[PDB]
C-alpha cells in the first residue's frame, strides 16, 4: 500500500508529517505497534503486561513476580521482550523503577537484540527530538537522576557501552523519552501503559488538530479527523482537551519545550467557560482531583466514587458541570460506577457530561465518541431504546472517524446498535 503521509522539514517546528494525497475524515493514515512499551505504574498487576487488558485474575512471571499476564499465550509471547528485564526486575526487588526507566530498558533490548522495527519506518529512536538545548538546569538534574536510576536497575544486563547501541547516550535517550512518550489508553480510555512509536512521533501538536490517534491494546491507529489537502501538515493534540490555555502553556513548556501561538492560545479560547463557578470551590476541587486521579490510576473505584460523591452531592457550594474540574469529577464518578456495577448512578453522571463534552471535544474526538457510547450502552440496558439509539448513532458518527473498522471497539458498537434496533423494531 502506498503511504498517504511523508516526513518533511517544517519551517519552525523541526520535522513533521504532511499529506501526500487529499485526506478525508476517518481515513486510516498509519498504524503501528510500539518500538517498546510497558504497563503503567497504576495498572501494573491490574492489566496484562502484553495485551493491556484487565482480568479478574492475572498470572505472574515466576522468576521476577512483577510481570503479570492474562493467559499462558500472553506470558509466552511476551517472553522474548521480557527475558532481559526479568533478571533486572528480580535483582532490584522490592524497588520498582519509574515507568520511563522500564520503558528505556525495553528500547535498549529491542535495539540490541531485535530485528529493525516497523515502528521506525518513517523515523527512528535515533532521529527523535531531544530538545537538549532548551532543557532548564532543573530538567537536566532530573534527567541525570533518571540516567543513574537506569544504570542501577539495568546492572545485571547492561554493564558498559558495549551492551548499548553504538554511541548511545543515556542522557539524550531520556531527553527523547520525555517529549516522545505516548500514553497508551485502553478501550474505555483508562491510561494503562506508556510506549514509543517513533514514526508517529513525527506528528507535531495542535490545540485544534486535523488527526487523532487511538489505541487498540498496544496497537496505534492514526486517522484524519478533518479534510486535509496535499502538502498540509498533519497534527495531533498532545494534551487532554479539558485544560485551560495556561495549563496547556505549562505542560507544552515543561514536557515539550515549546510555546504555542495558535488561535486558541492567543484568544484563551474556552478558558472562561471552563472556569465558571466560584474560584474557591473549583480550586478545592482541582486540589482534590490530584488524589481522585491517583486513585483512578490504581483502579481503586470505591475510593474514587466516595471522593467524587463528596463533591457532586456536597452539602457545601457546588460548581456548574461545564467547569472542567467539576466535569473531571463527574467523569471519574461515571467510570467508578460503571466498574462497580452502579449503572443507574453511572447514567446520571454520564448524562450530565454530555453537553459539556459536546462543547469541549469539537468535531470528531475519540474521548467524546467513547463517552457517548458508554451513555448509550447504559441507556440501552435500562430499556431507554429511542434515547440509547440516538446516543449509539452519535457515538458511531464520531467513532467511524476516530476508531474506524480496524478498531475492535467499532465491532462492539455495531453489536449495541443492532441490539437497540431489534428492540425498537419489536416495540
Ligand atoms: N505546535 C508546535 N510548535 C513548535 N514545536 C512543536 C510543536 N509540536 C511539536 N513541536 C516540537 O516537536 C517535539 C515533539 C515531537 N514528538 C514532534 C516531531 C518533532 N518536531 C521532531 O522534529 O522530531 C516538541 O518537543 C517540540 O520540539
Ligand atoms: Mg535532533
Ligand atoms: Mg531544537
Ligand atoms: Zn494478555
Ligand atoms: Zn519475569
Ligand atoms: Zn495552542
UniProtKB/Swiss-Prot annotation:
GO terms for cellular component: cytosol; nucleoplasm; nucleus. One of its GO terms (molecular function) is histone H3K36 dimethyltransferase activity. PROSITE patterns: SAM_MT43_2, SET, ZF_MYND_1, ZF_MYND_2. Residues 271-427 are annotated as: C-terminal domain. Expressed in skeletal muscles and testis. Overexpressed in a majority of colorectal and hepatocellular carcinomas. The keyword Phosphoprotein applies. It catalyses: L-lysyl(4)-[histone H3] + 3 S-adenosyl-L-methionine = N(6),N(6),N(6)-trimethyl-L-lysyl(4)-[histone H3] + 3 S-adenosyl-L-homocysteine + 3 H(+). It comes from the Eukaryota. A zinc finger (MYND-type) spans 48-86. It is an enzyme of class 2 (transferase). Residues 3-239 form the SET domain. Zn(2+) 2 binds at residues 61, 64, 82, 86. Zn(2+) 1 binds at residues 48, 51, 70, 74. The modification Phosphothreonine is found at residue 21. S-adenosyl-L-methionine binds at residues 13-15, 123, 131, 180, 204-205, 238, 258. Histone methyltransferase activity strongly stimulated by HSPCA. It is found in: Cytoplasm; Nucleus. Signal peptide: none annotated. CDD domains: SET_SMYD3. Keywords: Acetylation, Chromatin regulator, Cytoplasm, Metal-binding, Methyltransferase, Nucleus, Phosphoprotein, S-adenosyl-L-methionine, Transferase, Zinc, Zinc-finger. GO terms for biological process: cellular response to dexamethasone stimulus; establishment of protein localization; methylation; myotube cell development; nucleosome assembly; positive regulation of transcription by RNA polymerase II. The keyword Methyltransferase applies. It holds the Pfam family SET. Belongs to the class V-like SAM-binding methyltransferase superfamily. Histone-lysine methyltransferase family. Histone methyltransferase. Specifically methylates 'Lys-4' of histone H3, inducing di- and tri-methylation, but not monomethylation. Also methylates 'Lys-5' of histone H4. Plays an important role in transcriptional activation as a member of an RNA polymerase complex. Binds DNA containing 5'-CCCTCC-3' or 5'-GAGGGG-3' sequences. This is Histone-lysine N-methyltransferase SMYD3.
Amino acid at each position: 500500500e502506498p503511504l498517504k503521509v511523508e516526513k518533511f522539514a517544517t519551517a519552525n517546528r523541526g520535522n513533521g508529517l504532511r499529506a501526500v494525497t487529499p485526506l478525508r475524515p476517518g481515513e486510516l493514515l498509519f498504524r503501528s505497534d510500539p518500538l517498546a512499551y510497558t504497563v503503567c505504574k497504576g495498572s501494573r498487576g491490574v492489566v496484562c503486561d502484553r495485551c493491556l487488558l484487565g482480568k479478574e485474575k492475572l498470572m505472574r512471571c515466576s522468576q521476577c513476580r512483577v510481570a503479570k499476564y492474562c493467559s499462558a499465550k500472553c506470558q509466552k509471547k511476551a517472553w522474548p521482550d521480557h527475558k532481559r528485564e526479568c533478571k533486572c526486575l528480580k535483582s532490584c526487588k522490592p524497588r520498582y523503577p519509574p515507568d520511563s526507566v522500564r520503558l528505556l530498558g525495553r528500547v535498549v533490548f529491542k535495539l540490541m537484540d531485535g530485528a529493525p522495527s516497523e515502528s521506525e519506518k518513517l523515523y527512528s529512536f535515533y532521529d527523535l527530538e531531544s530538545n537538549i538545548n532548551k532543557l532548564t538546569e532543573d530538567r537536566k538534574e532530573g534527567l541525570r537522576q533518571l540516567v543513574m536510576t537506569f544504570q542501577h536497575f539495568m546492572r545485571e544486563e547492561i554493564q558498559d557501552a558495549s551492551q548499548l547501541p553504538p554511541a548511545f547516550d543515556l542522557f539524550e535517550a531520556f531527553a527523547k523519552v520525555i517529549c516522545n512518550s505516548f500514553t497508551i489508553c485502553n478501550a474505555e480510555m483508562q491510561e494503562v501503559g506508556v510506549g514509543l512509536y517513533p514514526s508517529i512521533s513525527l506528528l507535531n501538536h495542535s490545540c485544534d488538530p486535523n488527526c487523532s490517534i487511538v489505541f487498540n491494546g498496544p496497537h496505534l491507529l492514526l486517522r484524519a479527523v478533518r479534510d486535509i489537502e496535499v502538502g498540509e501538515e498533519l497534527t495531533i493534540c498532545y494534551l487532554d482537551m479539558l485544560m485551560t490555555s495556561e495549563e496547556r502553556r505549562k505542560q507544552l513548556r515543561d514536557q515539550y519545550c515549546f510555546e504555542c501561538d495558535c488561535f486558541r492560545c492567543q484568544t484563551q479560547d474556552k478558558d472562561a467557560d471552563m472556569l465558571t463557578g466560584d474560584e474557591q470551590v473549583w480550586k478545592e476541587v482541582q486540589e482534590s482531583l490530584k488524589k481522585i486521579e491517583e486513585l483512578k490510576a490504581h483502579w481503586k473505584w470505591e475510593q474514587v466514587l466516595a471522593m467524587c460523591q463528596a463533591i457532586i452531592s456536597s452539602n457545601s457550594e457546588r460548581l456548574p458541570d461545564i467547569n472542567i474540574y467539576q466535569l473531571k469529577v463527574l467523569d471519574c464518578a461515571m467510570d467508578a460506577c460503571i466498574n462497580l456495577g452502579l449503572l443507574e448512578e453511572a447514567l446520571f453522571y454520564g448524562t450530565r457530561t454530555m453537553e459539556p463534552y459536546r462543547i469541549f471535544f469539537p468535531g470528531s474526538h475519540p474521548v467524546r465518541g467513547v463517552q457517548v457510547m458508554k451513555v448509550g450502552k447504559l441507556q440501552l440496558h435500562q430499556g431507554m431504546f429511542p434515547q440509547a439509539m440516538k446516543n449509539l448513532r452519535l457515538a458511531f458518527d464520531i467513532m467511524r472517524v476516530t476508531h474506524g473498522r480496524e478498531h475492535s471497539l467499532i465491532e462492539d458498537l455495531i453489536l449495541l446498535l443492532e441490539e437497540c434496533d431489534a428492540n425498537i423494531r419489536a416495540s
